[PDB]
Amino acid sequence: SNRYPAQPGSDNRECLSMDYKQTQLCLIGCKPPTGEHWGKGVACNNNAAATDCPPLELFNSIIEDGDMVDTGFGCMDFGTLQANKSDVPIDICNSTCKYPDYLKMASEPYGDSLFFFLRREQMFVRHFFNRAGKLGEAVPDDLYIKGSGNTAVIQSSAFFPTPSGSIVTSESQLFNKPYWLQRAQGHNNGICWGNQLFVTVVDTTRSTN
Amino acid sequence: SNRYPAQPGSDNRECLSMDYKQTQLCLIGCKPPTGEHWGKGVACNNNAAATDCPPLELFNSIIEDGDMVDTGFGCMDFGTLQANKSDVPIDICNSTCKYPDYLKMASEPYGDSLFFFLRREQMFVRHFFNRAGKLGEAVPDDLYIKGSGNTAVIQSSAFFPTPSGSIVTSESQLFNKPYWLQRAQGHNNGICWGNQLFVTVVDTTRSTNMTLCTEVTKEGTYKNDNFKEYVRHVEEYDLQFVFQLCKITLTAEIMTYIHTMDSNILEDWQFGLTPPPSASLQDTYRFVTSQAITCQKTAPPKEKEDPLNKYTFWEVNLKEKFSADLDQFPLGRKFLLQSGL
Amino acid sequence: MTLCTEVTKEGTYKNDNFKEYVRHVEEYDLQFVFQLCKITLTAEIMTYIHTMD
Amino acid sequence: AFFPTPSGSIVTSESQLFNKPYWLQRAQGHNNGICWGNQLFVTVVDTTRSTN
Amino acid sequence: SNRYPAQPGSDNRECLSMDYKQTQLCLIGCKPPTGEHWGKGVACNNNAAATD
Amino acid sequence: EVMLVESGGGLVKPGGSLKLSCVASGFTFSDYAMSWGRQTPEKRLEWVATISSGGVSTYHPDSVKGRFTMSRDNAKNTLYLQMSSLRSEDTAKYYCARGGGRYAMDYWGQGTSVTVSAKTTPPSVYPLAPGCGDTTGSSVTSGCLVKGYFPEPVTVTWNSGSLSSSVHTFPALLQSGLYTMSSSVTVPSSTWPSQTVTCSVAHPASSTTVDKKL
Amino acid sequence: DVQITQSPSYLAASPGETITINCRASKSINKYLAWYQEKPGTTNKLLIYSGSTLQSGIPSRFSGRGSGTDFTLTISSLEPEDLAVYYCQQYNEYPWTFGGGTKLEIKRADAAPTVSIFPPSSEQLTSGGASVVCFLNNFYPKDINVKWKIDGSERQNGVLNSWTDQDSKDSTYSMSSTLTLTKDEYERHNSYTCEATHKTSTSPIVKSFNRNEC
């Protein structure tokens, strides 16, 4: 529901809390694994005198230990692309979350950053809420009919959902089993070059504190 | 619950968000496919219609690129049929949602708009809400008992359900998987005509939202009005393909079978056709801006005319991405194990 | 489905301008194939059928 | 200092692991089934039939 | 809903209830089994006493 | 049983703050609108704050813009009003409201006097009984006087409200920063003074009660 | 702002007849208008929201109508819980301003003030004040005037004027006339008389006392 109307005000934030996207995954390759993440860009030439909306770019990078996975808000920066740091929880409000680029590692010629990989993920929404700021974009008018009086003010449409992972079971366990090399995906068949390997894993079912 | 009596005033439209169907779907076919939708039609004016409801006709449209698939609120137009324009979402209210007529797609003789398809869908409904205003037809009094106090006047039964889909899992994805077609279901066994193919996909598992927070004035104390909040939405796509050339000896039994089927895959072949010789061919200039009084217009005759040019698609060039050696790709190796070679 | 037709025109929204109908639609289709079973007519056969029909 | 409330879920007759025979083809260790000391310490954990 | 400000007190305890996880497992052994549990152990001798 | 019980209104320093709480006894607090409105003397009922069914839509008039912040609790069934830097104009009697309709109000409690002033004063009570001389007439009008309280209000009840068919009680007036009042009852003379008669006067601000019987 | 005023502000009536009330508008605040009532100790009641549309539990004897800036509301067949103060209130735009208010009174047989005069008793003669109390009871209507004569000289400073309610059973009115004096002025002057005036008599109702007597 929404009983009309939205009210003016410059300060309306509060504490809430919520879970995230669940997963179980891994990857192995004798080159360190890569990963994209979205960020800003150069603006443009100043030929356009229309408005101010910022540019953007994804950024392809080999991810190291400690970096943050995307959980559904895009694989992106939270410091540069956002500006309040209050849409995001504190542990990840000051981060640049990534998503791995298995795709370009698939179109890698030899397949030396990839021997094998796993993934299992599921999701659904919990609730629907809305942002609180000036919507920079207006909505065209003839698409709807405006109301008057108490309904004269058009409320914003800066909605945002909030996630929920499903129930997990011990039958959904990925780990603690053997996964035999019999057929690799690429040209390097298990060969660790440099006598080194680059292993990764992300788990969510043992993520209590 | 919904108590009695009646409150209402002039207008009571509100703000809600909602979400929609979970799906995954695809289609392969060399001919372009159609897609049906509903819309208002012309009724008889010779009847003294005590009802004032307009009729509804199915219109078997041809699907363009970027037009809308059905969501579950009737496969109708929403511009000419939602006069309120404030009951159906804005994104679809000035558009029309579509569904495929698989059985009429099964009733094509050759089968050139369908080579293969799949669909994977799940949905359940969370909430329930109703409408207001002057409802079209009234209730017949003789199927209930009336009352008063709070139970005096009747309330509008103009309901509607709300879709909520299901969970969005990766454990039943259909992407990133090879599909080696052993045998196509119709007469066209996977052969393209006129060097073309039209494919599509609609998926909701990859449909997240990309918002944008832009502080316009730095201050260490919070104001809501520092922030011109923007939103974007991104999507990343790719395709792989493996072919097979085939030899057609143009015999008399074939050349009567195909020209009658389609003369257009003979005009690119120009066997025994007098116009494609013509004469001296097209003679170009070098581009001069002001003089050479002709312009960039299409009143010069088209070398290729079709009503598909009136529609807009995603044009994908593969006249240069061909390769004879296949093992250097992650599906060519997946083919030699599949072919046993 | 759900219909909405306005009666009047204004630049101000009121719910008492609009008329709403509701319909319910169905389509069905079929495809079959059969096979001829020829039936000879004998005395024990012709006694058997009139007991039924 | 947020904290959730754990819940669990539905329990079935198919989620049952007991009241059924077992015939182990091979024990996990170098000891392939030999008990010693004329004793053994068997343990089961079930909260599923733990209504009070 | 956790809206600002607080309505605190010098006492805030209450009567609640919760449910748990669904356990069915097997465990056998003729040697006694161990468990693990976190014990409040010590650091080194002089950690500058910044935060306890 | 739907009843909005007020709590938190009284004395407060000028330039200070206070916490109000309008606890509802029983209904579903998330279904219905809730509101705050006050009555100032010689003026209209003054709408202070409104809130919707869940809490989406809150508003205040031009008088309390920036100074007042409204809240609500849906589980403890309590509507709130956090105000800051109060002045002498905020001295009034305040209601909290339930909105059962298209932003329309069908409830308030008994309320509490939310008075922004300096100090309280315990009342010095004086009765008005028939004195020396013969008692005449079959009925006697008597009283009991209240002198020197600030701020409003007080209430006199005689003999636990059984004689409330004939109980009289007067309002007070502000003379030199204090209020002064009285009360009466018209009882036949079969009761007094053979059976004693008491008037009950209290004071909410000093929390000082002195009972006397005539 | 929207400045709506409520007229006529007072209604004396006998039930069964038809009684009309009005509220006029400053802006075109078209038909979004509710109506309320205040009974002390109980809750406010919404009779009709939006000018013409009815709330749960509200009966049919009410009737209200109007659009633009003109409105009319009319009531017949009254019931004894009605005696209260009634308001109109705009909510077409914030801030939600009100009408001035209309108190409904029931009409009865007229009555004269029952006058009984008292000195400040000897407990108040040692306390520090001197209030010459005199009760004027059981009259109708509210309009009276009392005259206090301090040794023939009138005093208007310190004169307190506070009228009672419509009472419970007898439904009359009373007004407090406390002559706020100090000790040396009460030492100087002996004769004090509440001289109530009413529409029953051209001669004012004069009752006196003597400290030489009692």
Author numbering:
A (entry chain D): 133 to 341
B (entry chain E): 133 to 473
C (entry chain A): 342 to 394
D (entry chain C): 290 to 341
E (entry chain C): 133 to 184
F (entry chain H), G (entry chain L): 1 to 214
Would you copy out the relevant sentences from the publication that reported this structure?
Human papillomavirus type 58 (HPV58) is associated with cervical cancer and poses a significant health burden worldwide. As has been widely reported, HPV virions are composed of the major (L1) and minor (L2) capsid proteins, which surround the 8-kb closed, circular DNA genome to form a T=7 icosahedral capsid ∼60 nm in diameter. Five copies of the L1 protein are intertwined to form a capsomer (or a pentamer), with 72 capsomers undergoing self-assembly to form one capsid, also termed a virus-like particle (VLP), that is composed of L1 only. Each L1 structure comprises eight antiparallel beta-strands (BIDG and CHEF) in the form of a jelly roll structural motif which is maintained by connections among the BC, DE, EF, FG, and HI surface loops.
We show that 5G9 and 10B11 adopt a top-center modality of binding to the HPV58 capsid, whereas 2H3 and 5H2 have a top-fringe-binding and A4B4 a fringe binding modality. Further analysis showed that Fab 5G9 binds vertically to the central region of each capsomer of the HPV58 capsid, and therefore, each capsomer binds only one Fab; there were no obvious variations in Fab 5G9 density when bound to pentavalent or hexavalent capsomers. For nAb 5G9, the distance between the binding sites of two adjacent Fabs is too great for a full-length antibody to bivalently bind the capsid, which was reported in other studies. For HPV58:5G9, Fab 5G9 cross-interacted with five L1 monomers in either pentavalent or hexavalent capsomer formation, with a buried surface area of ∼1,280 Å2 through its heavy-chain complementarity-determining region 2 (HCDR2), HCDR3, light chain DR1 (LCDR1), and LCDR2; these four CDRs predominantly interacted with the DE loop. Notably, amino acids R135, Y136, and A138 form the major interactions with 5G9, suggesting that these residues may be key residues for 5G9-based neutralization. For the Fab-PsV immune complexes, weak or incomplete Fab density in the reconstruction largely hinders the determination of epitope or key binding residues. This problem mainly stems from either occupancy hindrance of Fab binding (e.g., HPV58:2H3) or the mismatch binding of one Fab against the 5/3/2 symmetric region (e.g., HPV58:5G9 and HPV58:A4B4).
